[PDB]
């Protein structure tokens, strides 16, 4: 793109907080885990995706990341280390600091009430300066941070603070599982990145990565935000023109949000502009699932397709990333290919179909009869065999032109006939 002549000088030097280290030396399947090598960097700390991992396969490598956070609550970190039976003798600095925060707080908490009480701007803005200073120090006063950014988000340096603060809030309130407060930053961060301060390529790209995470936890059916992320900026597989960015799930969850909520007539716009472009060419070399999902599909394979599609669904059910719609993908991954395979077909067996997807032929029959009920194919079952038949040759296209080509001219000659 036109920004990418600029991105090509900077060569992937993004403003990460954790400095490239992760839960390293992993055992199990990698394109699932590799997302915590781009998130847990561009998206700062991503600690719910540490707690998720142990439940499928035990680690003690979540522990070094679990030492190093304070805005969730300081002492929750101070326990997980003790639980791993670690001497960590010199924890004398967070008890020093986070205590003396209560002494500092009794000023701002007093000033805060008295100002919003009076309705007096000056006493509220000097508070907002004292209080936007403070609410990055500890987040356990969650109601105080919530009350702070409620009335005024315009602080003494406006957009600079507001961005790192609404981002620090969108980050911390997902870690509190305060999804309603994170849904407040869903409104406010997406405007703050669009009304941009400087548009420097080091931050412009990172701000477009931050557009993922408010859609991602699925407490209140947020994936409808597919319709937002296609309108807010132009279409891209990754919203970063630096190809060194890689999210697998952004396209899997886009594929879920297209099919499971809207009509399949809407999916070949994606198959062009999001499944073939220059970023996605690098992506097609790498991810197994999302490759099988579309490359096998668009080639109109059926044999390797509906087998390796059915194989993806073993790796899908291994997902402990929080979503509501993991199974409506498993549903539609069988539906969508079947319609397209049978589209030009002669005669498919319900029995061959049922051997493949590991269902009984009765299920496959009522499934096919429901695909025909839904009128996604015009077909008819050879009931004796348990085979299903499409057979439109549709000869004689001549008549399609013949009515209108005269009905046009007979009513359009009326124009020149008038005067």
């Amino acid at each position: 793109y036109d920004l990418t002549t600029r991105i090509a000088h900077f060569l992937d030097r993004h403003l990460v907080f954790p400095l490239l280290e992760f839960l390293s030396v992993k055992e199990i399947y990698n394109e699932k885990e590799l997302l915590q090598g781009k998130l847990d960097l561009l998206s700062d700390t991503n600690m719910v995706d540490f707690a998720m991992d142990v439940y499928k396969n035990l680690y003690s490598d979540d522990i070094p990341h679990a030492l190093r956070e304070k805005r969730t609550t300081v002492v929750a970190q101070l326990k997980q280390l003790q639980a791993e039976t670690e001497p960590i003798v010199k924890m004398f600095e967070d008890p020093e600091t986070t205590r003396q925060m209560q002494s500092t707080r009794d000023g701002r908490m007093l000033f805060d009430y008295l100002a919003d009480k009076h309705g007096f701007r000056q006493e509220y803005l000097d508070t907002l300066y004292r209080y936007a200073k403070f609410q990055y120090e500890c987040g356990n006063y969650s109601g105080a941070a919530e009350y702070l950014y409620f009335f005024r988000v315009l602080v003494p340096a406006t957009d600079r603070n507001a961005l790192s603060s609404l981002w620090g809030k969108l980050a911390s309130e997902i870690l509190m599982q305060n999804w309603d407060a994170a849904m407040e930053d869903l409104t406010r961060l997406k405007e703050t990145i669009d009304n941009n301060s400087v548009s420097s390529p080091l931050q412009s790209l990172q701000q477009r990565t931050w557009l993922i995470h408010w859609s991602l936890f699925v407490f209140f059916n947020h994936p409808k935000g597919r319709d937002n992320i296609i309108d807010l900026f132009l279409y891209q597989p990754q919203y970063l023109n630096a190809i060194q960015t890689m999210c697998p799930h952004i396209l899997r969850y886009l594929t879920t949000a297209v099919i499971t909520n809207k009509d399949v007539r809407k999916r070949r716009q994606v198959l062009k502009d999001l499944v073939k472009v220059i970023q996605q060419e690098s992506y097609t070399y790498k991810d197994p699932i999302t490759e099988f999902v579309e490359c096998l599909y668009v080639n109109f394979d059926f044999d390797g397709a509906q087998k390796k599609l059915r194989e993806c669904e073993s790796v899908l059910v291994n997902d402990f990333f929080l979503v509501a719609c993991l199974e409506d993908f498993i549903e539609n991954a069988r539906l969508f290919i079947f319609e397209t395979f049978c589209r030009i077909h002669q005669c498919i067996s319900i029995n061959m179909l049922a051997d493949k997807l590991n269902m009984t032929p009765e299920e496959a029959e009522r499934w096919i009869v429901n695909l025909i009920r839904n009128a996604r194919l015009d077909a008819k079952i050879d009931s004796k065999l348990g085979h299903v038949v499409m057979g439109n040759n549709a000869v004689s296209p001549y008549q399609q032109v013949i009515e209108k080509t005269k009905s046009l001219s007979f009513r359009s000659q009326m124009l020149a006939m008038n005067i």
């Binding site: 793109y1 990418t4 060569l11 023109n241 220059i278 060419e281 690098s282």
Partner: protein, 228 residues
């Protein structure tokens, strides 16, 4: 020297025996250097370094990669050479910040259009289209002069030839059709006839372009181009 002897003759090959010796001189400008370190403006010598490796062809680029990779010697005395085409990405990236010193568009833009020719032969076809379609240089090189435009037209034809070498006939046709829109390829090499129709009427400018064209052994073959 190399522009001014007949290429169809023995003397041309006898004068190519110096093309290693110019590299043996400029490669010495690394171990013995005092200017301000390596990063003030001396970095010119390692644009001059790549100007003898940017073209080097598919067979030669695989001499350490497919011709026996494990058979050659492996000391620090050898590894300075065995870095090979990795020096051709080290010298793509490290000093862009220092070349940003020059406001001259007609020098600033030129480097990327040599650099893509590295990836196109020394690696995968995608990594050439990558650095091209990041950069959007066509409207800028139409503001730049003919000796920069040589690199745009030279590199764009390889993005089509590599598409055919991968078998993607559509994107091969998309890239090659621009150059093949007219019988201009001999004048894009800088070697056109003073007359070949009833049109040709310039003569003051022709001797400027005969001084400003590429040497023989860096020509890609035209029968090959037309077959591809």
């Amino acid at each position: 020297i190399m522009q001014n002897t007949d290429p169809h003759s023995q003397e041309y090959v006898e004068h190519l025996k110096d093309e290693a010796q110019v590299c043996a001189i400029i490669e010495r400008v690394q171990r013995y250097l005092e200017e301000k370190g390596t990063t003030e403006e001396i970095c010119r010598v390692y644009l001059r370094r790549i100007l003898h490796t940017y073209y080097k062809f598919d067979y030669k680029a695989h001499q350490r990669q497919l011709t026996p990779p494990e058979g050659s010697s492996k000391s620090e005395q050898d590894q300075a050479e065995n870095e090979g085409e990795d020096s051709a990405v080290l010298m793509e990236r490290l000093c862009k910040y220092i070349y940003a010193k020059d406001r001259t568009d007609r020098i600033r833009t030129c480097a990327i259009l040599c650099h893509i020719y590295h990836h196109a032969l020394h690696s995968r076809w995608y990594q050439a289209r990558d650095l091209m379609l990041m950069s959007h240089l066509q409207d800028n090189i139409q503001h730049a002069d003919p000796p920069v435009q040589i690199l745009y037209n030279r590199t764009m034809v390889q993005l089509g030839i590599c598409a055919f070498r991968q078998g993607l006939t559509k994107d091969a046709h998309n890239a090659l059709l621009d150059i093949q829109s007219s019988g201009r390829a001999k004048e894009l090499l800088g070697q056109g006839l003073l007359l070949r129709s009833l049109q040709e009427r310039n003569q003051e400018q022709e001797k400027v372009e005969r001084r400003r064209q590429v040497p023989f052994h860096l020509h890609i073959n035209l029968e090959l181009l037309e077959c591809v």
